[PDB]
Design an enzyme around this catalytic site. Structure first.
Site, PDB file in Angstrom:
ATOM      1  CG  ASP A 153       0.004  -3.957   2.708  1.00 21.42           C
ATOM      2  OD1 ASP A 153       0.604  -3.554   1.637  1.00 21.42           O
ATOM      3  OD2 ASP A 153      -0.285  -3.368   3.659  1.00 21.42           O
TER       4      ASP A 153
ATOM      5  CB  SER B 232       2.262   2.743   5.877  1.00 24.32           C
ATOM      6  OG  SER B 232       1.030   3.083   6.298  1.00 24.32           O
ATOM      7  N   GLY B 233       4.328   0.421   6.221  1.00 25.82           N
ATOM      8  CA  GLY B 233       5.668  -0.348   5.442  1.00 25.82           C
ATOM      9  C   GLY B 233       6.905  -0.563   6.412  1.00 25.82           C
TER      10      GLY B 233
ATOM     11  N   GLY C 282       1.328   6.747   8.650  1.00 23.65           N
ATOM     12  CA  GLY C 282       2.884   7.278   8.451  1.00 23.65           C
ATOM     13  C   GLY C 282       4.013   6.301   8.840  1.00 23.65           C
TER      14      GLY C 282
ATOM     15  CG  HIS D 276      -0.380   0.326   2.344  1.00 21.11           C
ATOM     16  ND1 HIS D 276      -0.300  -0.372   3.503  1.00 21.11           N
ATOM     17  CD2 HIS D 276      -0.376   1.657   2.982  1.00 21.11           C
ATOM     18  CE1 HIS D 276       0.152   0.032   4.611  1.00 21.11           C
ATOM     19  NE2 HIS D 276      -0.084   1.301   4.297  1.00 21.11           N
TER      20      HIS D 276
HETATM   21  F1  I9O Z   1      -2.033   5.594   3.720  1.00 17.91           F
HETATM   22  C1  I9O Z   1      -3.124   5.327   4.368  1.00 17.91           C
HETATM   23  F2  I9O Z   1      -3.147   6.367   5.362  1.00 17.91           F
HETATM   24  F3  I9O Z   1      -4.274   5.624   3.637  1.00 17.91           F
HETATM   25  C2  I9O Z   1      -2.956   4.214   4.958  1.00 17.91           C
HETATM   26  C3  I9O Z   1      -4.074   2.958   4.421  1.00 17.91           C
HETATM   27  C4  I9O Z   1      -3.848   1.762   4.807  1.00 17.91           C
HETATM   28  C5  I9O Z   1      -3.332   1.257   5.920  1.00 17.91           C
HETATM   29  C6  I9O Z   1      -2.437   2.266   6.692  1.00 17.91           C
HETATM   30  C7  I9O Z   1      -1.557   2.147   7.724  1.00 17.91           C
HETATM   31  N1  I9O Z   1      -2.148   2.133   9.077  1.00 17.91           N
HETATM   32  C8  I9O Z   1      -2.738   3.281   9.588  1.00 17.91           C
HETATM   33  C9  I9O Z   1      -3.892   2.705  10.781  1.00 17.91           C
HETATM   34  C10 I9O Z   1      -2.957   1.770  11.552  1.00 17.91           C
HETATM   35  N2  I9O Z   1      -3.261   1.576  13.220  1.00 17.91           N
HETATM   36  C11 I9O Z   1      -2.159   1.011  13.524  1.00 17.91           C
HETATM   37  N3  I9O Z   1      -1.524   0.437  12.386  1.00 17.91           N
HETATM   38  C12 I9O Z   1      -1.886   1.214  11.473  1.00 17.91           C
HETATM   39  C13 I9O Z   1      -1.297   1.150  10.286  1.00 17.91           C
HETATM   40  C14 I9O Z   1      -2.402   3.545   6.109  1.00 17.91           C
END
Ligand code: I9O
Ligand code: CA
Length: 223
Positions: free
Chosen positions: A84, A177-178, A175, A40
């Site tokens: 993912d 993420s990854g 933020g 993602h």
């Molecule tokens: F890029 C975004 F912002 F659209 C996006 C999409 C999907 C997933 C994520 C990452 N999560 C956010 C919530 C969370 N709560 C614990 N860990 C996470 C990581 C971001």
């Protein structure tokens, strides 16, 4: 990272920042030429930033290297976030040192109860928004499959695990993420998703890296 601590500069030497004019995702250096991140996080025009602490200040240990290729997992589904995971190849090899180092892939999967380290430059607030300059860290245990599935009915696949705290207060966030989930010196997870951040009964969900080791190794071997 919500409810974490300041890691300390270059104490997480495999942590990368993916930059497209600004930090947008984390990743993990797995050899001198390759980074693992979340599917993602895919976009074009990625610069990989290694050796970072403060992402807004050039402190002297950074290496900035453009991506030459990204490879999203063939079976990634962006609706469900199944599979993912993404690989990013660097245009040139990173110089490896104490502050910029690769993290080992797992040879076996990690069990519920295993203590891990999660890190990133994501949001530090569960309500509202504040983005840090320096790298944040969180120690968190892997949760049982049953409790993960209970938390997220109908959403947890065999390629996902939960880690964190059912009571809330401590989690990864937007933020992050990854970025890495490292347990006993192995990359076991990638920050994938959740429902908000640090909410009660809504722990973070992570890509189960051990399921992808074969794919990672054979992809690297031919790219
Ligand atoms: F890029 C975004 F912002 F659209 C996006 C999409 C999907 C997933 C994520 C990452 N999560 C956010 C919530 C969370 N709560 C614990 N860990 C996470 C990581 C971001
Ligand atoms: Ca910096």
């Amino acid at each position: 990272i919500v409810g974490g601590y300041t890691c300390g500069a270059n104490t997480v030497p495999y942590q990368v920042s993916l930059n497209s004019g600004y930090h947008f995702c984390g990743g993990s250096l797995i050899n001198s030429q390759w980074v693992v991140s979340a599917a993602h996080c895919y976009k074009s025009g990625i610069q990989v930033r290694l050796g970072e602490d403060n992402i807004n200040v050039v402190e002297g240990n950074e290496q900035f290297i453009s991506a030459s290729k990204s490879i999203v997992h063939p079976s990634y589904n962006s609706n469900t976030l199944n599979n993912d995971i993404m690989l990013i190849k660097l245009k040139s090899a990173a110089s490896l040192n104490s502050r910029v180092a690769s993290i080992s892939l797992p040879t076996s999967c990690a069990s519920a109860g295993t203590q891990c380290l999660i890190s990133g430059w994501g949001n530090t607030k569960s309500s509202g928004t504040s983005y840090p300059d320096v790298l944040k860290c969180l120690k968190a245990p892997i949760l049982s499959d049953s409790s993960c599935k209970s938390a997220y009915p109908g959403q947890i696949t065999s390629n996902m695990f939960c880690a964190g705290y059912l009571e809330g207060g401590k989690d990864s966030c937007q933020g992050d993420s990854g970025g890495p989930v490292v347990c006993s010196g192995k990359l076991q997870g990638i920050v994938s998703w959740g429902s908000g951040c640090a909410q009660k009964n809504k722990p973070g969900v992570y890509t189960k890296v051990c399921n992808y080791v074969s794919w990672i190794k054979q992809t690297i071997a031919s790219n």
